[PDB]
Structures are given as C-alpha cells and as structure tokens.
C-alpha cells in the first residue's frame, strides 16, 4: 500500500479530453479506465470512442448526451464484443445514429469490477490497477472554477454524486488528495487535473461509484 500513486508516470492515460456541451461524463470516465486497461494489456495505449459510447450504449441503459453510468459502458463493450478507436470514431459531442464498426475495434472487456464502497478500497484499486471510474458530486460553482489545490467541499454530498471521472493516482503535499482526470479540457483546473480531498469521509462521494473494467 504505497504511499504516492500517479499513473500518468507509467503510460496508462491518455491526454484531456473535452465531452463539450453534452452530458457524456459517464463515456470519457469509461473510455479512460479502459484506455488504463487495455494498455495494462497489451502494453499499448490507444484512445478511444466516447461518441461510440453515446451513440450505441441505449440498450444498456445509457441516454447518450442525456446520461449513462460507466457500467453500463463496460457492458456494453461486453455484449458487443469490442469498442472502436477514438480516430475511427471521432466526438461530436451530440448524439447520431450508431456507426460501431467491428473492423476497428481496439479494445475489449469481460466485464467490470464494482469496488467496496470505503476509501481504503479504493486506495487499493487504484494502487494495484491502474486508473478508476468514479462519480463524485461536481453540481457545485466551486468546482467548475477549482484553478488549482487540494479541492474541499463541505457542502458535497457524499450520496448524491452527479459527474463520472477518473481517479490516476493519490498523494499528499509537504493533506492527502486523489488525483483526478477530468473531461472539460484542459484549460480547467490543473491542466484538466483536479486534486480532491483524500480520507475525509469520502468526500463527494469519490469511493462510492467506483469500478473498474476486466479486460
Ligand atoms: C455538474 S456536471 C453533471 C453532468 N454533466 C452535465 O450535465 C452536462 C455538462 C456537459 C459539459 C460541461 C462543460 C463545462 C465547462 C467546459 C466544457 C464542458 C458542463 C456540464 C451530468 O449530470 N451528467 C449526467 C446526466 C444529467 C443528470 N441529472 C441532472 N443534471 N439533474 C450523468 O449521466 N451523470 C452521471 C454520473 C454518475 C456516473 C456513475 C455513477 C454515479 C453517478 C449520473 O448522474 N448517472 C446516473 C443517472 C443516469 C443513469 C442512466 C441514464 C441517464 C442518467
């Protein structure tokens, strides 16, 4: 159980992306703890399709730029057998007609792992995974303008977590944070990043969603 952990450093996530004015969160939260997997895999890391995702994902229950759940992505990357690259199926950020194409499928899973809803066991996925897929609650104007620091809101809810991201990693600063990939871009908070208060009883909620694709 280290007591620093930054996936980024190992080649398992890929750059900020932006799911634009569309509620999509569930996909890029899905599409980047894939994205860990596979490479976790294979070895190579290989961007993949939100739009894919929010397009064909009804079955499964997601409502495309309405909402969905990151399980009901790894789900239905399950039923279907493989999900396409990013470049094969570009973003739109607004929902169309589904376009999967088996050709260019890049990646897979068998379905997913639902973490014990309790900080420490998130500290260990995270440890001995790679990056998770967690909701923490993010209604908040503070967060939308979080520029930088250790995020601490005590006015989230710890039961009500309404956006999907990325937990990469955990550590403290000379306290503790999770690190976390966001998908507004870039141009927010750290460069897309956000550090979010760690072992404060569950704060949003972060370690109440989490989980994880099996590939
Ligand atoms: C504060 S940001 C929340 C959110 N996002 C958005 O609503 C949209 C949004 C998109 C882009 C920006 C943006 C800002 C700056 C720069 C660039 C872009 C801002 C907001 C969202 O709620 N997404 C949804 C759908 C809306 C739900 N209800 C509501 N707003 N009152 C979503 O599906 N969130 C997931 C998160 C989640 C994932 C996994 C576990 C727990 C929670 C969810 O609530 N899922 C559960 C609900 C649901 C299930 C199946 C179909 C539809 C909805």
Redesign the pocket.
Known sequence: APRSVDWREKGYVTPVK?????????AF?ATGALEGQMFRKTGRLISLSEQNLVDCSGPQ???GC???????AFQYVQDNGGLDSEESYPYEATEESCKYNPKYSVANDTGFVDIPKQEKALMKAVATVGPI?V?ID??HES??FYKEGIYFEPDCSSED????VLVVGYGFESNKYWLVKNS??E??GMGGYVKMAKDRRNHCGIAS?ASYPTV
Do not use: V
């Open positions: 932006n799911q634009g004015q569309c509620g999509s969160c569930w939260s229950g997601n409502e309405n909402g969905g759940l990151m399980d009901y897929s909701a993010a209604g967060f939308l977590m309404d956006h999907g507004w871009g141009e927010w969603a």
